[PDB]
Amino acid sequence: NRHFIDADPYPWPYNGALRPDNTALIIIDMQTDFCGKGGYVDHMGYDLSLVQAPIEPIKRVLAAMRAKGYHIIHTREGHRPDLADLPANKRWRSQRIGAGIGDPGPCGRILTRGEPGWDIIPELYPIEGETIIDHPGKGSFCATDLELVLNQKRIENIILTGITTDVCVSTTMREANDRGYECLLLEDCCGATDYGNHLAAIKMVKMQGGVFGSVSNSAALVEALP
Amino acid sequence: MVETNRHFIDADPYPWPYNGALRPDNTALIIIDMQTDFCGKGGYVDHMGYDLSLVQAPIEPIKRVLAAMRAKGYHIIHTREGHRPDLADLPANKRWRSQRIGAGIGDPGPCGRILTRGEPGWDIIPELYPIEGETIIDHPGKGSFCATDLELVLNQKRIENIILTGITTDVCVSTTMREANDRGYECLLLEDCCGATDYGNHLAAIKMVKMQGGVFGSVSNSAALVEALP
Amino acid sequence: NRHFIDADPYPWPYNGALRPDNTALIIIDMQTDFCGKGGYVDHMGYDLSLVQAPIEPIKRVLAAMRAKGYHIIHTREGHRPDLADLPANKRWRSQRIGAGIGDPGPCGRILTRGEPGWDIIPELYPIEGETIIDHPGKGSFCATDLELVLNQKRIENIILTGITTDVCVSTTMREANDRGYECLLLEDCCGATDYGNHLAAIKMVKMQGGVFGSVSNSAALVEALP
Amino acid sequence: MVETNRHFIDADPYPWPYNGALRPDNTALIIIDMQTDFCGKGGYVDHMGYDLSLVQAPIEPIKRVLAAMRAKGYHIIHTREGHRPDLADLPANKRWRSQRIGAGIGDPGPCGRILTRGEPGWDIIPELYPIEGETIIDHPGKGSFCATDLELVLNQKRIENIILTGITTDVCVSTTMREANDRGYECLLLEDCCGATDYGNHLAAIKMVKMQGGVFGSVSNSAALVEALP
């Protein structure tokens, strides 16, 4: 009763134990300031097109997985408004490049919880029953309840999407993988503002027999999802 | 004439550490996973075929950094990827992938059971071997913090700054750096003191550090470190 | 320049390094449902006076520590409204005794974030700059950002107050202690609805040369606080 | 006869485990810190002046539970409180308190360095010694989860239910139970298979488990467990 998604370097999940009850989609950090028109990333002159590219593929995956009753998780990078959870180095670096965390930006205080720019874009907005992880690190597990939630939901398999490929997506995948979760990265459902780093982050997954999991795409997923 | 207790290493994208608080008592070198099976002649990677040279390249630069930091009384930490001999800490997926490529964790290899604690091939190579007082982290994950006492040890030693070296750049080195960075540690990657199975992935992992004002920390090299280390 | 508070079994903190910048008060779980008139604990017929007894001493400590610019932290036990962070056993036990987590109670859904009964009582309410930890376990560190926050604030010493002595107070103290924090329990600033368990939890702290830290009282603290 | 795959142990305040899902593959015994120095002459606990009879009392009941659970193929886990020999994992306060009462961690004792890994007094007593395949957790905290791989191991073994035994009831046993419970594990404390430095603290720690509908789990005894274990 095994089901697999075509993937590289191996058909996923490794053991074919692919069910709604043990599998989650995670949509990482699809926040206005990071990928929306007029957000701080746009205003900083970064290559915003590369982080908008995954929106439509993600929307298709999200619709398909909702329809089939899979677990859906979303994440938002951000800090408490009093900045208690903000490391001094993280803050200093952000100030040095003119995107200081907690400072005013075009859509509110940058990377600050409760602000408009920090929220998820409307095109990928959560619905009730889809857990949202608010995380202060680049890996979504650090200092959050993500692992607790995954464990109570008895999730074994994680399908990763979102931004950026080389930062929060890769870090969260690595954290999950170390703990035993079986992870699939959808290459057309992630992006970074450096395309080379996007492609390299994906390549890294596949090495050594799928060191961090396996890689597929939205069409292959939607076609074969049970 | 004018003396300062702030000290920096020339680094990219910013001089490191960010605040110049660079002292023996708050700074550690970490040498990641310089183990025989991974970089050594006759280990399991060698027995599979062609190319150890990329993961051996950092040995001499690491040795220079290690010697310099020992002489100046900096904290020195080493790590080893590996599993309990009964494999209780080995996830099923990790095991299955390693079996599928012919390097099954816990399976017999030319230097003992692959990635298995206590076996000859699993140990750190003699030329970078720890000495007394240099903590060794035995880790079952690619990130050295997961399921270990690394963070507890760092905190009791009041370590603020970490200098990362070892192998592989894109796997255990990058994962450990990301975990440390998230927790507030200030990290420097020495680019000539790491290497990977694919040189392009090595270079990309280094580039990733530098983006967005040094998202994971900063990058330097052994010569710049040794020259400016207080 | 060492400063100590009189305490049992040793003067606290162990090394006398007692400063506003390295020391936090933590006020644990002083929530309406747990200690307020008409909350679920009151309606169940427990002896509410034992968990109200610490309010006035806590107020005195809180005022003194605010005035001197010490770090102030508050905690609230609770669950996400969709109960994603609620273990099945925790839920089942609560249902079995007629205080089901997430079920309707006299002040709103029991132990559910955002509900009236779940919030901190008005007499001990946080002010801006005082971090609040929302925790799904009895130990406030589990699945939260408390440790991350303590580390960024460079906190070494923790003064524990709140309720209940034997559950969240003792558990949070034990977690902190294991990680190297130096902890003081203020015995008149905690309570439980079984006074024997309160007293025993306090006794446990002092054994073996102060296995979990040291114990004092609000008067001794306020008198000697630098 | 009507047969069921739900099975319960008579326990207080509720029959355990809550859902009756009690099988060898999902259930572990954990034997906490039955080490020579906690329950034998010359140890840490001995140096503090406590009465050894209270911590020896659980030996025979634990032995019976251990034998029964081994025979039925249940998971068996053991723990040892202790520190790396260089004391890198030893908080300064923990060390200072132990020195103040004359049982300094790492100081020489009649059975080796107190609470120091690799020393004779730190090892598990022979009457409860692990066998191959029984994971041992070496922990620097009073809660066995802190800074260890216990959680990772539990998760890879798909353990849901934990039966706790060992010493001391109010310190490492209670702390480990609370950590497990918070993470969703379903825990049973065997009251005749634990003991403490003060019998009243033992009894109170057990009572604490039962309050509020079994806030930390449920409580039973060796005879009830062995009688009903599937």
Residue numbers in the entry:
A (entry chain D), C (entry chain B): 8 to 233
B (entry chain A), D (entry chain C): 4 to 233
Quote the paper.
Herein, we have described and characterized the structure and catalytic mechanism of BiuH, a cysteine hydrolase that hydrolytically deaminates biuret during cyanuric acid catabolism by R. leguminosarum bv. viciae 3841. BiuH is structurally and mechanistically different from the ‘canonical’ AtzE from Pseudomonas sp. strain ADP, which fulfils the same physiological role; i.e., it liberates a nitrogen atom from the triazine ring and allows further degradation to make all three nitrogen atoms bioavailable. The protein is a tetramer (consistent with SEC); each monomer adopts a five-stranded parallel β-sheet which is surrounded by α-helices. Helices α2, α4 and α5 (residues 95–102, 178–186, and 202–213, respectively) make symmetric interactions to another protomer in the tetramer, forming a dimer, as part of the basis of the quaternary structure.
The native protein was purified (20 mg from 1 litre of culture, concentrated to 10 mg/mL) and crystallized after removal of the His-tag in situ using chymotrypsin, in neutral conditions containing medium or high molecular weight polyethylene glycols as precipitants. Proteolysis did not impact the activity of the purified enzyme. Depending on the structure and the chain, the loop containing residues 44–53 is at least somewhat disordered and has a higher B-factor than most of the rest of the protein. The average B factor for the chains where the loop is mobile (in more than one conformation) is about double that of the average B factor for both the whole of the protein chain and double what is seen for the same loop (44–53) in other chains where there is a single conformation. Phe41 is found in a mobile loop that appears to occlude the active site when not occupied by the substrate.
